[PDB]
Amino acid sequence: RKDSSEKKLITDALNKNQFLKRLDPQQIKDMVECMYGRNYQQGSYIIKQGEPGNHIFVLAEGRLEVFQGEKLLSSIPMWTTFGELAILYNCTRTASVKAITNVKTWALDREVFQNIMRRT
Ligand SMILES: Nc1nc2c(ncn2[C@@H]2O[C@@H]3COP(=O)(O)O[C@H]3[C@H]2O)c(=O)[nH]1
Numbered sequence: 001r002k003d004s005s006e007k008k009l010i011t012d013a014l015n016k017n018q019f020l021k022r023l024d025p026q027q028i029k030d031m032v033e034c035m036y037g038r039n040y041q042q043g044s045y046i047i048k049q050g051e052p053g054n055h056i057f058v059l060a061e062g063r064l065e066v067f068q069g070e071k072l073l074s075s076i077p078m079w080t081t082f083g084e085l086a087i088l089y090n091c092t093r094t095a096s097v098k099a100i101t102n103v104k105t106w107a108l109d110r111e112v113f114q115n116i117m118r119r120t
């Protein structure tokens with residue numbers, strides 16, 4: 001369900017990110033075009049610490065909080081990219097991300113991201 005206005009929102013979210021804003025505009029456009037919706041019910045984990053990363057996400061609606069074990073670190077601001085660290089640095093997920101309310105995201109698969117990155 002991704003129209004002109006939603007693509008602008010995703011584009012602007014991606015360009016907030018210190019890494020992604022250094023990408024070519026076409027690479028950002030590719031990311032947006034290749035993203036798909038993933039929604040999560042309150043209580044579910046989007047990301048679990050120590051797992052391999054398989055997506056980059058943009059938060060589109062709802063509340064997401066970041067934890068390391070039982071320690072609460074942050075609430076992810078709306079229309080912000082997350083889950084980029086494990087993908088960009090090939091470390092495991094640095095922290096868990098949990099849906100505090102029902103959440104909507106736009107997701108990009110790792111393999112598609114890596115395909116886009118290779119046009120650098
Ligand atoms: N470690 C950490 N990750 C955060 C924080 N806020 C948001 N995040 C995001 O949560 C993500 C969890 O997966 P990644 O480690 O791959 O990438 C992480 C960041 O994008 C924070 O305060 N600490």
Ligand code: NA
Nearest residue numbers: 049067068069
């Ligand atoms: Na920890």
